[PDB]
Structures are given as structure tokens and as C-alpha cells.
RNA sequence: ACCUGGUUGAUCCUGCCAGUAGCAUAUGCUUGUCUCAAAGAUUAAGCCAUGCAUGUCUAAGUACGCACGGCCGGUACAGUG
RNA sequence: ACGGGGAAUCAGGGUUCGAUUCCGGAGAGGGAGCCUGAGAAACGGCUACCACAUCCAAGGAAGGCAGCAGGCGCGCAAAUUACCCACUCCCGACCCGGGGAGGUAGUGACGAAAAAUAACAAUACAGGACUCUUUCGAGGCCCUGUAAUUGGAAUGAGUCCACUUUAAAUCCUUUAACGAGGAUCCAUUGGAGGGCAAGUCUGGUGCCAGCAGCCGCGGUAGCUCCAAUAGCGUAUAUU
């Protein structure tokens, strides 16, 4: 006897203003832990006959007791539309975006240090 | 304050926007525009809260900056644009047209209209005056000014305007027996027939209305918008035909339906 | 996985997905080709008597002593509850994707539409009455059958006959055609796929207990040929 | 300005006379028969019942055909029938005035588990609930004070993952099997 | 150790209270065996009835 | 006789005492698991080290910083800045 | 004595609070003046006076936390000098930049909600409970008691992988392996009682009473009851 992971889709609607299809995802995994998002993306790509790079899923909460999980998912028409319409952190979760490796304090102090210099020498402030 | 205010607290926002309490501290302050702040629906609220096309304000901005949303036939990219009563909203990408009409609960309703109906709107005449070189001018409720109006049109009348050209096609006179909608007060969103008008010099006039079920109510003259000539409206109406129903008569109709079933 | 006796089984038409119900009041979903368990459904308040399914991802169950018939929308995760004839509902069968027929132990036979909460037609005492004077009760309905996508219905009891019925226009009326003499408990009725013959399972006793025994009956499988002439 | 909520209320009131023999005896009887933890659990239910009966009395002060009386009384009677304290044949305000605290105590999940034979004692029922052995329909519930509605009463059983519910044997069984 | 858990402490208080009540009042019992006597004495001079006046 | 107890030969008046529940201020002993919320106050709107809290560019106002750069003799200005 | 929407308590009428997250007003150490601008008598703008106060080569120069953190206010004392513009919205030439406004975590049982610290069986031995009673007495039993033994089921506090969450995280929810007999993996706070020697003090009615007693000749290698229960007390003022 084998256990199965079941994927179900609800509240499917087609958003032509943002060029995507969005839905609620229900995952049945009676004995196991919460299914990772990558496997959900592969299964949903097999379900909807697309490549996994255009599927973005998030907001997965497991119910008390451990039977079911509920999340949200979007499938884009093309990868260009995904790169143009998605928020930057969801792109970064896929490895498409890289953020600044600094802190607010450093940038604020550097700006306030630049405020004291006039002319080309502004470029010389460390 | 030392000048104009630029913020709006969420709990101090108009109640018909149906905003919840825990989303944030602030609400969208509408931009200045054709309609008043307390009697408008901002584009962001209509686009993400009523239609659920967007999840955040950034997605509303992304939708609007693609020049997809047209208001009264013109593309608007401002997400806090004040859209008001009898406004036409067109989205050709989804093939949808909407008209902002109050429901019986006093809120703007998601009312879809036919594309042929989307070519005109109704406006209430607010002012008539003679401008330079003796040219008559007419000012409507949505700040539209029109030159050379028909001499028969007076204040408190209704005109039908073609959106493409912005010109008057025909008009309805303010008279007893015409159909009207209430745009303010306790009877907001109720449709009926004008029965008589009471005049108070130096004060506010009072108008009496009766709906299709025979119920009578009264409002001030500034809260009435003439919709149709006779009993026939010149625009499509929402799901409720302007009749505000009570709990007792709702029980009565439920009992009638239960008796008629079987 | 079931905690009581299994009472109903049906494969989903065109797939290898199997549905089971039991006296433990649960409905379970299996996949035979992958020998795996899927999920469990609840909602019945008594032991379930019968189960049937078709090409759609859906099944219907007879509630037995509970007195309800329930429709399981599995991908939609929704449940429809139908309230019908008095007495225990012991058998059920689908006519098409939208209509179904059930029998009860008070002799009633009902026609259902899957979009209305009450029977469309109700035929009381389908097989007549029995018992001593002053204590008469109708024959129990043990099995029902329908020919798929048609209007032919067969009902079986221990009244020593198999009865054929016609569904009316809109399934609002049930009309008797003929009686086929057959002695014993008609425990199971299945039409052929082509519709050329009807198979009846005959026993000396009811399939669920030994409340009656008919000595004259033979424990046999009976093939009833149906001949069609315009 | 913050985006938080400050709405809260107390669910019980301490008794007005702290030294009454009858009150202490009644509390002892209730706690003993229903296996409660302390006096606060009794006072909570007493507070709820006091609110309900005050509302019923205030409605009974009005005229029979008063619309407010009809609307609010029908709502209250429907809620009381739904939670299972009243009967469908007793839909009047007088029967609301007849209500007692034991009627509300009988609707807790702890006493429901014991009365249905899943447990052999009221304290055993409390322990079974607190150890995640009990399900209501799909949902696993571990709150002893869960108030069972009329429809939910027929769907209380052992959870599918429980050792009592056909699940995997527990820690002690596995260790003892490994020993021998 | 009984004071550690308030629930089991209340459980013992109820158990003792039913024992103490047995002195005041007689508990109702069914005839689960054939009647064979009182198993205690029968006192004929003690009168427990309540006088109505 | 408008709570329960006290202050008389009897009946009273006036001053009184103790018990019963809360709010505020300050302060103790204890505190395994979890969710939500709060945080003023010396009549001192008394005094403040350090850092941060207000900036902003589209195809579309002004580029002769090689600061970097493609094409070149068409060479007023490619483009980024 | 900032005002109101409001909070508490009432049978009602009222009474007492309202610096405090919404609306309106006022101020930016104190009194006056002014520039720019559509809008300021602006103070994270400017000028002079009063009071404070920093650097100096002694000539001069620079200031305003009743913004967010943080320090001081005789010696005596209570939130982080944290993360981020992902949400909500605002400003700009702007779809893209900025925002201690806001959001996210941390921090004294001050306040509100849920809720563990065990459950189930068995064995042996005894004969006495219990209620009302101002020391007398009257009722009464289908059990009680034993710091007595025995068994194999259940589970989370914790330890420790992996997901899930989120701007990144934490928490909650899932989940593999460990994790219970004095289950010592040991609940507290207030009130009221008992028990004692070759011991100490005080007063007497020879042999007693009071207060109290880890202190005795030698010797130094875990009593009971009551109220509440993760809560429970005290002082001042008052209703
Ligand atoms: Mg301000
Ligand atoms: Mg705005
Ligand atoms: Mg407890
Ligand atoms: Mg006196
Ligand atoms: Mg520009
Ligand atoms: Mg003052
Ligand atoms: Mg105030
Ligand atoms: Mg000012
Ligand atoms: Mg100061
Ligand atoms: Mg300006
Ligand atoms: Mg100033
Ligand atoms: Mg400042
Ligand atoms: Mg300022
Ligand atoms: Mg500060
Ligand atoms: Mg100090
Ligand atoms: Mg932001
Ligand atoms: Mg940004
Ligand atoms: Mg702040
Ligand atoms: Mg402490
Ligand atoms: Mg404390
Ligand atoms: Mg504190
Ligand atoms: Mg609490
Ligand atoms: Mg992560
Ligand atoms: Mg043991
Ligand atoms: Mg002595």
C-alpha cells in the first residue's frame, strides 16, 4: 500500500490584465510533512501542461491535524510576462533577482556624508 | 494645519467603500477631480477590492500604466482617480463595461452594461449662465461645461451626453411623474416617481417620491437625479429595481414562495 | 482500512479509480493500478447500503436506516443530501449522469434528479402487499436496475416476480410494463451492455440476513433474454 | 496609530457572596459529575447562562407582536436549538427561562465522548481529548470545552492516525516489541 | 503530591463527599438479586415519617 | 422592620464601630505550554552625548568631465552618465 | 480646566473619569520679528533679546529629542542606541527612487482567551465508616482503609532532521528519530490547627500555667485542614 499526494485546484480565474491564471491550491498529504514548493510546481506543471518556470506558488498553511494544506498559485503566459509582472522577492526565490548586499544604516550614513561635499568630489565619499 | 491635508485615516474613510479595519492605518485619499471626496469611488478600490483583479496597490499601478482602463472613454493612469455616479468604466482587454450606480444599500454596485449602452451618460444640470459674447453655458454635476445648450434646458434637468463627442443628444425635464433616483441622505439608492415638490424660499426645497410598491418618502431637492421620462428609465438598473425591502415583507415573499412550491 | 463490513463498490467508468463504502459510515477512494489509498469521506449517519458511480468523478450512496441519499462531488469537495421515502434505503442505481433510482424496505421505488432535493416520482408498494389480514405490509425491495441512457427500469423483491418499469417524460412518472415469473429473493439485477438480456441473482434468503427462507427457490443465476420488436 | 485590535472581554465573574455552603456544595457536585478543573470553568458557564436568561426576560417584557421581540426571540431560539440545549418542540421564551447549567455542561466534548462509550470515565475522556485521539468529522479537536452542536454529535469518533483508530501503534508498544 | 494537580484534587474531594453523604441518606438500589432479607437489622421502634399539620 | 451584627428600666434622637464587593497608586512570593494587547504622569511644556527621521528623472527642459564608450570622414549632437 | 466622539457604575435619574492610536484646537526652552511660497508668523527655516550650553590657536564659530531609539533629573536603578520599505498609504520629473509615517521581531504575570502536571486494570491483608448532637446520646451500612504491592497501554515538556511561514527570519501549524513509575521529568500563594526533651525564661494555685522550643549528656559522618489555583497576598487612599 502506497500513500499519495493529491493536488486540487479551486477558484480558477484568468487575469488578462496581468496575463496570468490564478487559483487556490489544496494539497492532500495524509501521513507526510508539508510538501515543498518545488515539487508542487512540478506536479502543477504536469497538471496544466506547462513548464515549471512560469508557475509561482506561495502562502501555504497546513491545517491543524496535518491532513491538508492550502496555498495560492499563478501561472504566467510567458517568462517575460513573469519577469515583468511578478514582485522581486518571488523572482529572487527562483534565482532571477539579486538584491543589495547592504543595510539601511550604511546607505543613510553615506548619504548624510555626501550632503557635506559639493561638486565632483561627491564621487570620492566612501 | 498650515495647509492642505494629504492623508486619510482608514477608519475615517467613507463607510460605503467597505474597507476592513486590520489591513492598515491608511486609506487612499482620492485625488481632486470631477466628483467630491465623500461621494466617489477611487479607481484602486474598484479595481482590487470590488473586482479582485489585483492583490496590492502595486499591481493596480501595473494594470493602470498599461493604459487598459478607460473612464468615460478616456484612459486614466491615476489610481486614486475619483469615479462617481453615472460614470462609465471600460476594459477592452476583458471585454467589460461598467456603470457606477447606487444599490439599495447605499453603495456603488458592480453593474455590467451592454457596449451600446456604454456610449452615453446622464448628467444633472447644475448651472446655466451667459458667458463672453453672449454664448450660453451649462454646467453639470460632474464639472462638464457645455456651450450652446438647448434653450429649454433649465437647472435640475437631466441631459444625455454622447461620450465620444461630449454633446447633448436629448434631455428630460424636472416634473412630477418622472422617474428619479435618490443620491444622498437616508433614502440613498431608491428609485421612484416624483409626486409633488414643496418650495421654501431662502431654504431647501423638499420633494416627495413614491416607488413601485406604493411606499412614500421625502428628500431634499439636491438629492434627486431624474433618470427617466414617465416610468421608463433611460439607463439599465441593477439587480434591485430601487425597492428597499423590509424583513416582514421578505418573510411574506418567502412564505408565498414556499406555499407555491409543491 | 475499513472498520466494518464493506457494502458497496464501483469503479469510475473509464478509469481504474475505485470507490468503497462500508457499515463504518465512511466512503473511501482508491487507485487500483497504483495500489494506493487516496482519501476518506464522511457525512452519513448510519450504515451505508449501496454505492454507484459513472464516468464523472462522482458517486451516490444510499443511507439505509438514515433515510437519505447523498451525492459526492469529490474534486469539488461538496456534498448533496436528498431526503426521500420512508424506511431503509437498501439499493440504488444510476440511470444516466443526472438521474438515478432507489428502492426501500417499505416497498417504495423512487426516481431522482441529481439537481433536486426530493424524488421526482414515488411508486408506493411496487410489488404489492403480504401478511395476514390486519397485519399486512408491503414486500421489501431488494434490488433495482436501470438500463444506461434509456428509460427501462427493473425492480426485484421476494414477491415471486421481476417487474419492468418505464420512466416517464422528465422522470416524473413510473409505469409498469410486465411481470417475469421468478421464485425467490431477487438479490441482484444487472442489465447487459447491449441491453439484450437481464441477469438476476436468485436466492432462498435475503442477501443481508435470514429473516425469510423460501424453500421453493433455487440458489441460481438466471439469464432473462430481452427481445425487442418495434 | 496602529493596525491592531483592542476588543476583548471577560468570560466570568467571581461570586458575590464568597462564603455560602449551598454555593460550595453545588460547585462540588458539578465539578465532580462533569470532571472539571476548577471553579472558573463553572463560573464561565454560569456567566453565559445568565446572559441568555437575561436576554429572554427582557424580550418577555415586550408585547407579543412587537417586531423586535419576534426577530430577536426567533434568533435566540434558533441558536439554542442549534447548540442542542432546547428541543424543536419547545420553541418559546418560557422554555429558555427553564434552562439550567447542567444542560450546557452536557454539551461539552468531554462529556459527549464519555456518554458515547469512547471512554470509560469522564477523566479518561478528558485525557483522550487532550492527547489528540478524538475527531469531529475530518477535524481533530483537542479542546475539552468544545461545545458540540446538534449535527456534529453523530460524527465524533477516534482519529484516523490514533492507535485506537486503526493507526500506527504508539511509542510504548513499539519499544516493548523491540525488547521482545 | 495530590496538591500538584488541581483536577485530580477535586476528583478526590467528590469521592469523599459521596462517602460522607452515605451517613445522612440511603442510596437507591435495584433488585439485581432475588430478595433475601435486609442484611442488617429491622428496627421496629424508630419512626422516620414527617408529621403534617 | 429597606443587609448581617453592637453603643439603653422602656421608647427614641444625635454622634459612632465591625463584616460583605470593586477602582487607583506602590509593592511582595510564585511563574511549565500557547494566542492577543498594552507601555503617560516630580504641577519637571525640566535638561540632553551619538546616529537616524525628506527627497525627487521620463522617449519627451539644459552634457564639449574620454567618466565610459560604437561608428567614422561626413563631423552640430550615436548612446550611458 | 485642551474640547468632543467616548469609558465606568447604576432600576432609573444621575454621578465620576476622558494626557492617551478618530475629529477639532494649540505649541516646539521663553517672550517678539521676518524671508520664500498657492498655502507658514514654519522652528529636523532665518534675525535680535533672556535663560542654558559645545569647540577654540581667544580673533571667532556652531546650537534646540513635547520625532524614533538612547542617557540624566542628590547615592536608590525597569522596553531595543534591533530588521525592512514586502503590506497600508504619502512625496517626487517618477511603473522603477525615498519614507524611525507605518510594518516586523525583542523586552517586568500590568490586562484579556485557551490549557498540562496523568489515565486504566489487578492483588493481598485488616475491621470498622459516616451523619446529627454543647462531654450525655440518637441513627446507620451491598463497603471503607492500608506513606501495601502488581501489570502493560497512552501522551507531551524537552532533545534533534527536514519542510512550511516571511522582504529575510522568528512564532504557530505539519513531520522522521529519541523522550515516564517515587511517571524525583516532584505547583504555588494566603489562612487555621496538632505533635516533643535529663532544653531555656517568667509567674504561681506542692505535681501548675504562660511564652516558646533544629539550642539536650555525648557525637557530624518531606504533619493535618480550609479558600483559590498558574496564580495568590500586603500597605495607603477611596467608592
Ligand atoms: Mg500635523
Ligand atoms: Mg492621493
Ligand atoms: Mg489545572
Ligand atoms: Mg447610642
Ligand atoms: Mg517629463
Ligand atoms: Mg492645564
Ligand atoms: Mg482628549
Ligand atoms: Mg505651529
Ligand atoms: Mg525640553
Ligand atoms: Mg509652491
Ligand atoms: Mg517660530
Ligand atoms: Mg527637533
Ligand atoms: Mg516640523
Ligand atoms: Mg526619544
Ligand atoms: Mg535616575
Ligand atoms: Mg513601502
Ligand atoms: Mg520603491
Ligand atoms: Mg512610530
Ligand atoms: Mg518576578
Ligand atoms: Mg503581580
Ligand atoms: Mg509592569
Ligand atoms: Mg488571564
Ligand atoms: Mg525559507
Ligand atoms: Mg507501572
Ligand atoms: Mg511549661
Swiss-Prot record, chain A:
InterPro entries: eRP_eS24_sf, Ribosomal_eS24, Ribosomal_eS24_CS, Ribosomal_uL23/eL15/eS24_sf
GO cellular component, one term: nucleoplasm
Keyword RNA-binding annotated: no
Bias-annotated ranges (Basic residues): 101-119
Modified residues (N-acetylmethionine): 1
SUPFAM superfamilies linked: Ribosomal proteins S24e, L23 and L15e
Signal peptide residue numbers: none
Sorted UniProt keywords: Acetylation, Cytoplasm, Diamond-Blackfan anemia, Isopeptide bond, Nucleus, Phosphoprotein, Ribonucleoprotein, Ribosomal protein, Ubl conjugation
Tissue: Mature tissues, such as adult brain, skeletal muscle, heart, and kidney, express low levels, whereas tissues and organs with significant populations of proliferating cells, such as fetal brain, placenta, bone marrow, and various glandular organs, contain significantly higher levels.
Subcellular location: Cytoplasm; Nucleus, Nucleolus
Gene3D superfamilies per the UniProt record, alphabetical: 3.30.70.3370
GO molecular function: RNA binding; structural constituent of ribosome; translation initiation factor binding
Phosphothreonine, modified sites: 9
Cross-link entry Glycyl lysine isopeptide (Lys-Gly) (interchain with G-Cter in SUMO2), positions: 37
Ranges where the record places region Disordered: 92-126
A biological process from GO: translation
Domain of life, source organism: Eukaryota
Protein family (similarity comment): Belongs to the eukaryotic ribosomal protein eS24 family.
PANTHER family in alphabetical order: 40S RIBOSOMAL PROTEIN S24
Subunit structure: Component of the small ribosomal subunit. Part of the small subunit (SSU) processome, composed of more than 70 proteins and the RNA chaperone small nucleolar RNA (snoRNA) U3.
HAMAP family membership: Ribosomal_eS24 (MF_00545)
The protein's name: Small ribosomal subunit protein eS24
Biological source species: Homo sapiens
Higher taxonomy: Eukaryota, Metazoa, Chordata, Craniata, Vertebrata
Swiss-Prot record, chain B:
UniProt KW keywords: Acetylation, Cytoplasm, Isopeptide bond, Nucleus, Ribonucleoprotein, Ribosomal protein, RNA-binding, rRNA-binding, Ubl conjugation
Biological source species: Homo sapiens
Family in the record: Belongs to the eukaryotic ribosomal protein eS4 family.
Subunit structure: Component of the small ribosomal subunit. Part of the small subunit (SSU) processome, composed of more than 70 proteins and the RNA chaperone small nucleolar RNA (snoRNA) U3. Identified in a IGF2BP1-dependent mRNP granule complex containing untranslated mRNAs.
Keyword rRNA-binding included in the entry's annotation: yes
Xref: PROSITE patterns: RIBOSOMAL_S4E, S4
A GO MF term: rRNA binding
PANTHER family: 30S/40S RIBOSOMAL PROTEIN S4, SMALL RIBOSOMAL SUBUNIT PROTEIN ES4
Residue ranges of every copy of the S4 RNA-binding domain listed in the record: 41-103
A single cellular component GO annotation: ribosome
Highest taxon of the lineage: Eukaryota
Crosslink site: Glycyl lysine isopeptide (Lys-Gly) (interchain with G-Cter in SUMO2): 229
Functional summary from the UniProt entry: Component of the small ribosomal subunit. The ribosome is a large ribonucleoprotein complex responsible for the synthesis of proteins in the cell. Part of the small subunit (SSU) processome, first precursor of the small eukaryotic ribosomal subunit. During the assembly of the SSU processome in the nucleolus, many ribosome biogenesis factors, an RNA chaperone and ribosomal proteins associate with the nascent pre-rRNA and work in concert to generate RNA folding, modifications, rearrangements and cleavage as well as targeted degradation of pre-ribosomal RNA by the RNA exosome.
UniProt name for this protein: Small ribosomal subunit protein eS4, X isoform
Localization per record: Cytoplasm; Nucleus, Nucleolus
Residues with N6-acetyllysine modification: 232
Curated annotation (Swiss-Prot), chain D:
InterPro entries assigned to the protein according to its UniProt record, in alphabetical order: Ribosomal_uS4, Ribosomal_uS4_CS, Ribosomal_uS4_euk/arc, Ribosomal_uS4_N, S4_RNA-bd, S4_RNA-bd_sf
Any one GO BP annotation for this protein: translation
Region called Disordered, residue ranges: 161-180
Ranges of residues in domain S4 RNA-binding: 107-180
Residue positions, PTM N6-acetyllysine: 65, 115, 154
Modified residues annotated as Phosphoserine in this record: 152, 162
Covalent crosslink: Glycyl lysine isopeptide (Lys-Gly) (interchain with G-Cter in SUMO2): 92, 138
Assigned keywords, A-Z: Acetylation, Cytoplasm, Isopeptide bond, Nucleus, Phosphoprotein, Ribonucleoprotein, Ribosomal protein, RNA-binding, rRNA-binding, Ubl conjugation
Alphabetized GO MF terms: RNA binding; rRNA binding; structural constituent of ribosome; translation regulator activity
Pfam families: Ribosomal_S4, S4
PROSITE patterns: RIBOSOMAL_S4, S4
Localization of this protein: Cytoplasm; Nucleus, Nucleolus
GO CC annotation terms, alphabetical: cytoplasm; cytosol; cytosolic ribosome; cytosolic small ribosomal subunit; extracellular exosome; focal adhesion; membrane; nucleolus
Function: Component of the small ribosomal subunit. The ribosome is a large ribonucleoprotein complex responsible for the synthesis of proteins in the cell. Part of the small subunit (SSU) processome, first precursor of the small eukaryotic ribosomal subunit. During the assembly of the SSU processome in the nucleolus, many ribosome biogenesis factors, an RNA chaperone and ribosomal proteins associate with the nascent pre-rRNA and work in concert to generate RNA folding, modifications, rearrangements and cleavage as well as targeted degradation of pre-ribosomal RNA by the RNA exosome.
Family: Belongs to the universal ribosomal protein uS4 family.
Identification of the protein by name: Small ribosomal subunit protein uS4
Curated annotation (Swiss-Prot), chain E:
Post-translational modification: Citrullinated by PADI4.
Skewed-composition ranges (Basic residues): 1-23
Subcellular location: Nucleus, Nucleolus
UniProt region (Disordered), positions on chain: 1-40
Biased composition regions of type Basic and acidic residues, renumbered to the chain: 24-35
Quaternary structure and interacting proteins, as annotated: Part of the small subunit (SSU) processome, composed of more than 70 proteins and the RNA chaperone small nucleolar RNA (snoRNA) U3.
Family: Belongs to the SAS10 family.
Role this protein plays: Essential for gene silencing: has a role in the structure of silenced chromatin. Plays a role in the developing brain. Part of the small subunit (SSU) processome, first precursor of the small eukaryotic ribosomal subunit. During the assembly of the SSU processome in the nucleolus, many ribosome biogenesis factors, an RNA chaperone and ribosomal proteins associate with the nascent pre-rRNA and work in concert to generate RNA folding, modifications, rearrangements and cleavage as well as targeted degradation of pre-ribosomal RNA by the RNA exosome.
Protein name (record): Something about silencing protein 10
Organism: Homo sapiens
Amino acid at each position: 500500500m502506497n500513500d499519495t499526494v493529491t493536488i486540487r485546484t479551486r477558484k480558477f480565474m484568468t487575469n488578462r490584465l496581468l496575463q496570468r491564471k490564478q487559483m487556490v491550491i489544496d494539497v492532500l498529504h495524509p501521513g507526510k510533512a508539508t510538501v515543498p514548493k518545488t515539487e508542487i510546481r512540478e506536479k502543477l506543471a504536469k497538471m496544466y501542461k506547462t513548464t515549471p518556470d512560469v508557475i509561482f506558488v506561495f502562502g501555504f498553511r497546513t491545517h491543524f491535524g496535518g491532513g491538508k494544506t492550502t496555498g495560492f498559485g499563478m501561472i504566467y503566459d510567458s517568462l517575460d510576462y513573469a519577469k515583468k509582472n511578478e514582485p522581486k522577492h518571488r523572482l529572487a526565490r527562483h534565482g532571477l533577482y539579486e538584491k543589495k548586499k547592504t543595510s539601511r544604516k550604511q546607505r543613510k550614513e553615506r548619504k548624510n556624508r555626501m550632503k557635506k561635499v559639493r561638486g565632483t568630489a561627491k564621487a570620492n565619499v566612501g | 494645519a498650515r495647509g492642505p491635508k494629504k492623508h486619510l485615516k482608514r477608519v475615517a474613510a467613507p463607510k460605503h467603500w467597505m474597507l476592513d479595519k486590520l489591513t492598515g492605518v491608511f486609506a487612499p485619499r482620492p485625488s481632486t477631480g470631477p466628483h467630491k471626496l465623500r461621494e466617489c469611488l477611487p479607481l484602486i478600490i474598484f479595481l482590487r477590492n470590488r473586482l479582485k483583479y489585483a492583490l496590492t496597490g502595486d499591481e493596480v499601478k501595473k494594470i493602470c500604466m498599461q493604459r487598459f482602463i478607460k473612464i468615460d472613454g478616456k484612459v486614466r493612469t491615476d489610481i486614486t482617480y475619483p469615479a462617481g455616479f453615472m460614470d462609465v468604466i471600460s476594459i477592452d482587454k476583458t471585454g467589460e463595461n461598467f456603470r457606477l450606480i447606487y444599490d439599495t444599500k447605499g453603495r456603488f454596485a458592480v453593474h455590467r452594461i451592454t457596449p451600446e449602452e456604454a456610449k452615453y451618460k446622464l448628467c444633472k444640470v447644475r448651472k446655466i449662465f451667459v458667458g463672453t459674447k453672449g454664448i450660453p453655458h451649462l454646467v453639470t454635476h460632474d464639472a462638464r461645461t457645455i456651450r450652446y445648450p438647448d434653450p429649454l434646458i433649465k437647472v435640475n434637468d437631466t441631459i444625455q451626453i454622447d461620450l465620444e463627442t461630449g454633446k447633448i443628444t436629448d434631455f428630460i425635464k424636472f416634473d412630477t411623474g418622472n422617474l428619479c433616483m435618490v443620491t444622498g441622505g437616508a433614502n440613498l439608492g431608491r428609485i421612484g416617481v416624483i409626486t409633488n415638490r414643496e418650495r421654501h424660499p431662502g431654504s431647501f426645497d423638499v420633494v416627495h417620491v413614491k416607488d413601485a410598491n406604493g411606499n412614500s418618502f421625502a428628500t431634499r431637492l439636491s438629492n434627486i437625479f431624474v433618470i427617466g421620462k414617465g416610468n421608463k428609465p433611460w439607463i439599465s438598473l441593477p439587480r434591485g429595481k430601487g425597492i428597499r425591502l423590509t424583513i416582514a415583507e421578505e418573510r411574506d415573499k418567502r412564505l408565498a414562495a414556499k406555499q407555491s412550491s409543491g | 482500512g475499513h472498520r466494518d463490513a464493506v457494502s458497496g463498490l464501483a469503479f469510475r467508468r473509464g478509469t481504474h479509480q475505485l470507490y468503497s463504502t462500508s457499515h463504518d459510515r465512511s466512503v473511501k477512494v482508491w487507485n487500483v493500478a497504483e495500489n494506493s489509498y487516496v482519501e476518506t469521506l464522511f457525512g452519513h449517519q448510519d450504515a451505508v447500503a449501496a454505492l454507484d458511480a459513472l464516468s464523472r468523478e462522482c458517486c451516490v450512496t444510499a443511507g439505509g436506516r438514515d433515510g437519505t441519499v447523498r451525492v459526492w462531488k469529490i474534486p469539488e469537495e461538496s456534498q448533496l443530501v436528498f431526503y426521500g421515502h420512508q424506511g431503509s434505503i437498501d439499493c440504488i442505481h444510476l440511470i444516466n449522469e443526472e438521474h438515478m433510482v432507489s428502492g426501500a424496505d417499505d416497498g417504495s421505488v423512487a426516481l431522482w434528479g441529481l439537481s433536486k432535493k426530493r424524488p421526482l416520482a414515488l411508486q408506493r408498494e411496487a410489488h404489492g402487499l403480504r401478511g395476514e389480514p390486519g397485519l399486512e405490509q408491503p414486500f421489501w425491495i431488494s434490488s433495482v436496475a436501470a438500463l444506461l441512457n434509456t428509460d427501462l427500469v427493473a425492480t426485484g423483491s421476494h414477491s415471486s416476480c421481476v417487474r419492468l418499469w418505464q420512466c416517464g417524460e422528465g422522470f416524473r412518472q413510473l409505469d409498469l410494463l410486465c411481470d417475469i415469473p421468478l421464485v425467490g429473493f431477487i438479490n441482484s439485477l444487472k442489465f447487459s451492455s447491449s441491453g439484450d438480456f437481464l441477469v438476476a441473482g436468485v436466492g432462498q434468503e435475503h442477501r443481508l440476513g435470514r429473516w425469510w427462507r423460501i424453500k421453493e427457490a433455487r440458489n441460481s443465476v438466471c439469464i432473462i433474454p430481452l427481445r425487442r420488436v418495434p | 496609530p496602529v493596525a491592531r485590535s483592542w476588543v476583548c472581554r471577560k468570560t466570568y465573574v467571581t461570586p458575590r457572596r464568597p462564603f455560602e455552603k449551598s454555593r460550595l456544595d453545588q460547585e462540588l457536585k458539578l465539578i465532580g459529575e462533569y470532571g472539571l478543573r476548577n471553579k472558573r470553568e463553572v463560573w464561565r458557564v454560569k456567566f453565559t447562562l445568565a446572559k441568555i436568561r437575561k436576554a429572554a426576560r427582557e424580550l418577555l417584557t415586550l408585547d407579543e407582536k412587537d417586531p423586535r421581540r419576534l426577530f430577536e426571540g426567533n434568533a435566540l431560539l434558533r441558536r439554542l436549538v442549534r447548540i442542542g440545549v432546547l428541543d424543536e418542540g419547545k420553541m418559546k421564551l418560557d422554555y429558555i427561562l427553564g434552562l439550567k447549567i447542567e444542560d450546557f455542561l452536557e454539551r461539552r466534548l468531554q462529556t459527549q465522548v464519555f456518554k458515547l462509550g469512547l471512554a470509560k470515565s469522564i477523566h479518561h475522556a478528558r485525557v483522550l481529548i487532550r492527547q489528540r485521539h478524538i475527531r469531529v468529522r475530518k477535524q481533530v479537536v483537542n479542546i475539552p470545552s468544545f461545545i458540540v452542536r446538534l449535527d456534529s454529535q453523530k460524527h465524533i469518533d477516534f482519529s484516523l492516525r490514533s492507535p485506537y483508530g486503526g493507526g500506527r501503534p504508539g511509542r510504548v508498544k513499539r519499544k516493548n516489541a523491540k525488547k521482545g | 503530591k495530590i496538591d500538584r494537580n488541581p483536577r485530580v484534587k477535586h476528583r478526590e474531594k467528590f469521592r469523599r463527599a459521596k462517602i460522607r453523604r452515605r451517613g445522612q441518606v440511603r442510596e437507591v438500589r435495584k433488585e439485581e438479586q432475588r430478595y433475601s432479607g435486609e442484611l442488617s437489622g429491622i428496627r421496629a421502634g424508630v419512626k422516620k415519617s414527617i408529621k403534617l399539620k
